[PDB]
Design an enzyme around this catalytic site. Sequence first.
Site, PDB file in Angstrom:
ATOM      1  N   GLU B  11     -27.849 -23.766  11.626  1.00 34.69           N
ATOM      2  CA  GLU B  11     -28.538 -23.413  10.971  1.00 34.69           C
ATOM      3  C   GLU B  11     -30.516 -23.616  11.018  1.00 34.69           C
ATOM      4  OE1 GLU B  11     -28.316 -21.054   8.722  1.00 34.69           O
ATOM      5  OE2 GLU B  11     -26.474 -21.127   8.568  1.00 34.69           O
ATOM      6  N   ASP B  20     -35.666 -16.693   7.497  1.00 32.54           N
ATOM      7  CA  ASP B  20     -34.059 -16.671   8.290  1.00 32.54           C
ATOM      8  C   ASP B  20     -34.452 -15.273   8.945  1.00 32.54           C
ATOM      9  OD1 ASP B  20     -32.605 -14.337   7.066  1.00 32.54           O
ATOM     10  OD2 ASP B  20     -31.851 -16.247   5.819  1.00 32.54           O
ATOM     11  N   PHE B 104     -20.551 -19.922   4.472  1.00 32.06           N
ATOM     12  CA  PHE B 104     -21.961 -20.455   4.376  1.00 32.06           C
ATOM     13  C   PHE B 104     -23.190 -19.540   4.507  1.00 32.06           C
ATOM     14  CE2 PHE B 104     -24.558 -24.613   3.902  1.00 32.06           C
ATOM     15  CZ  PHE B 104     -25.549 -23.862   4.905  1.00 32.06           C
ATOM     16  N   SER B 117      -9.469  -9.320  10.305  1.00 34.53           N
ATOM     17  CA  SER B 117      -9.425 -10.123  10.818  1.00 34.53           C
ATOM     18  C   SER B 117      -9.032 -11.707  10.367  1.00 34.53           C
ATOM     19  CB  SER B 117     -11.053 -11.027  11.106  1.00 34.53           C
ATOM     20  OG  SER B 117     -11.496  -9.879  11.702  1.00 34.53           O
ATOM     21  N   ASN B 132     -11.578  -8.885  17.349  1.00 35.11           N
ATOM     22  CA  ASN B 132     -11.207  -8.182  16.201  1.00 35.11           C
ATOM     23  C   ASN B 132     -13.126  -8.680  15.392  1.00 35.11           C
ATOM     24  OD1 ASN B 132     -11.193  -8.366  12.954  1.00 35.11           O
ATOM     25  ND2 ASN B 132     -10.310  -5.512  13.802  1.00 35.11           N
TER      26      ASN B 132
END
Lengths: 162, 162
Positions: B11, B20, B104, B117, B132
């Site tokens: 991040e 972002d 997150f 998945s 996957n």
Amino acid sequence: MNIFEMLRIDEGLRLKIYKDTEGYYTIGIGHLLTKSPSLNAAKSELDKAIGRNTNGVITKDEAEKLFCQDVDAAVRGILRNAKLKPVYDSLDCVRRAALINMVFQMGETGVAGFTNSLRMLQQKRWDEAAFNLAKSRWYNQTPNRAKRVITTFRTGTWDAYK
Amino acid sequence: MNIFEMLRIDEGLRLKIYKDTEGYYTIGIGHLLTKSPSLNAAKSELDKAIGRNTNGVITKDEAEKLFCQDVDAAVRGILRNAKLKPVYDSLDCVRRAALINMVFQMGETGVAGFTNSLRMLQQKRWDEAAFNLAKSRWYNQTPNRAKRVITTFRTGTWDAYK
Ligand SMILES: [Cl-]
Ligand SMILES: [Cl-]
Ligand SMILES: [Cl-]
Ligand SMILES: [Cl-]
Ligand SMILES: [Cl-]
Ligand SMILES: [Cl-]
């Protein structure tokens, strides 16, 4: 600062089996192996924990893996405990870290029995809680660490760790 | 390596409001402020989050506090989710970190919808799960980060972060 950095400060890092403050065999970042007086018993616990024949020595990566599991376990212990969960839920993130720290050191059952201190924490009577927490074997036996943890509960800041 | 160090890598850390990868106002260590196009709306969310008039700038301590809350929130989201909790419970500590990372980034509801998945992860079919997971907007839009997270799921090691 965060719960991992906090406990790393409080627990240190050692890559060979050593005795902790209570005289118990330990390795890594405060990973208690056993309360048994037997080094061979400790070595067997270590091999089981790491998944290989270690002969009393681990790598930093392995130490950090046990640490991740142990922090995870302390949080799980709090969440599963009828006494600890309400207090934990009531706290901010910094004070949650202080509670995790205590559980990491003393265990779920050990901390859950601190009925009066937990009540003061839940009530957000921070100075009162801090004074009450210091009336403990915990504080008397590891005063510098307990002072840091108590400061964290009192202030809701990381001042004791900076 | 641990979940905090992992997300800090993924991040970054920026002390002023920025956009972002999706073009949304963000600050600190991946703290999403709002999906609103309005910088003033983002500034108001920031002041509310920090508890003071920040004017679009925070300190490192404040950034780390939002980060602690956001990691806490991702874990809480997983534990409260009927789809995510079983998978999380089934994983080792390193792979738990990978799941927290996804939540997150994408949110509880976003990840909980990855039904196929999640099934492969629960089944411990690591290579299949990895293939996957890469069939996703997530992977295509943030390939380097997704590759690191997928490697973590595939291997159960921190190799992608070292
Ligand atoms: Cl054993
Ligand atoms: Cl001490
Ligand atoms: Cl000290
Ligand atoms: Cl607002
Ligand atoms: Cl990326
Ligand atoms: Cl990158």
